[PDB]
């Protein structure tokens, strides 16, 4: 899997949005969470149309989306697939999730997991929900993890062949490595 | 790609339905097309719920679906992606295409490309349309082909690594091989 591909947009944005907005800890430090519009510009950068339409009114919607996706991802990390499925199914019903083909300005045809007339927060809700749902269908639930590092509860999706990744980031991987000698 | 997998159901059923119902020629012989309910029982065998609900009233709907999918697949084989996209988008709008997670009786979670309360022909229309649409999004249009054998216009999706398959079936591959010496 290429987590940066168009095809994994919903998965990638879900992880990134939860990791921005969900309070907890990040890379060894308490993390306040929430977000500001600048976080959304960078979150949604792969879609110039979204970025062109973002306003401060979208922040509350993305914070709420983050809360819902965090609950689902945490459920998946615990094997509580039914809990995640119930929530994702409701999002797919509530928001416009009819797929639609369209051609990017460079000519590339894409399958969008929403109609092009969707509103912005409903659109991203559908995209994110389908992306997580798809990974459940693809039997990848065990690849959703919560960072094993001290004072980090950021989420990750393990893209390794072996499926034994423990840490959310190279940052946490490095922090653990750098503590190994002294903690021996 | 595994064309027999759950994940390629829409693609597989689309090809099979077109090849049953579309008049033309098949494996060297004129092909009348149409279908009967027995064709649908075998077409949809991977879904016991569909098979349990099939009736003769569904035959007309599947013949019409076949006509629409044949037009799309023939368009794809010609690189006429916009023509295919317009038709597939309309099917996805017309029919229930909201995805839904559910657990098979064996416990396996699946992403269905329709709500579980869908009617039978609308359901299969959505499944088939999404399956074809997905392959357009995955940049696989050039893998949709029309058999090169004499008096065969059956369709196929090339699953080979090299993407140079010419014939719809081992049957047509063998018929061509068996004619090579005499036609030399
Ligand atoms: Na919906
Ligand atoms: Na941790
Ligand atoms: Na629809
Ligand atoms: Na032919
Ligand atoms: Ni999109
Ligand atoms: Ni289904
Ligand atoms: Zn971490
Ligand atoms: Zn053939």
Numbering used by the authors:
A (entry chain A), B (entry chain A): 1 to 184
Task: Copy the relevant paper text.
The crystal structure of Jann_2411 from Jannaschia sp. strain CCS1, a member of the Pfam PF07336 family classified as a domain of unknown function (DUF1470), was solved to a resolution of 1.45 Å by multiple-wavelength anomalous dispersion (MAD). This protein is the first structural representative of the DUF1470 Pfam family. Structural analysis revealed a two-domain organization, with the N-terminal domain consisting of a new fold that we call the ABATE (for Alpha-Beta-hairpin-Alpha TandEm) domain and the C-terminal domain forming a treble-clef zinc finger that we have termed the CGNR zinc-finger domain after a characteristic sequence motif that is conserved in this family. Jan_2411 forms a dimer, with both monomers implicated in the formation of a putative DNA binding site, and analysis of its genomic context suggests a role for the ABATE-domain family in stress-induced transcriptional regulation.
The final model included one protomer (residues 1–184), three acetate molecules, two glycerol molecules, one zinc ion, one nickel ion, two sodium ions and 240 water molecules in the asymmetric unit. Arg185, Ala186 and Thr187 at the C-terminus and Gly0 remaining after the cleavage of the expression/purification tag at the N-terminus were disordered and not modeled. The first domain (residues 1–142) can be visualized as two subdomains (H2–H4, β1–β2 and H5–H7, β3–β4) that share similar topology and secondary-structure elements, namely a helix–β-­hairpin–helix motif (H2-β1-β2-H3 in the first subdomain; H6-β3-β4-H7 in the second subdomain), with an additional helix (H4 from the first subdomain and H5 from the second subdomain) linking the two motifs. The helices of the first subdomain (H2 and H3) are stacked per­pendicular to helices H5 and H7 which, together with H6, form a helical bundle capped on one end by the 310-helix H8 and on the other by helix H4. The second domain (residues 143–187; H8, β5–β6, H9) forms a treble-clef zinc finger. A high degree of conservation is observed for a number of positively charged residues (Arg143, Arg161, Arg165, Lys177, Arg182 and Arg184), suggesting that this region could present a nucleic acid binding site. Furthermore, residues 146 (a hydrophobic residue) and 167 (an aromatic residue) are highly conserved and could intercalate between the DNA bases. Analysis of the crystallographic packing of Jann_2411 using the PISA server and analytical size-exclusion chromatography in combination with static light scattering indicate that a dimer is the likely quaternary form. However, given the prediction that the C-terminal domain binds DNA, then the N-­terminal domain may allow the protein to act as a signal-dependent transcriptional regulator with the ABATE domain conferring sensitivity to some as yet undefined ligand.
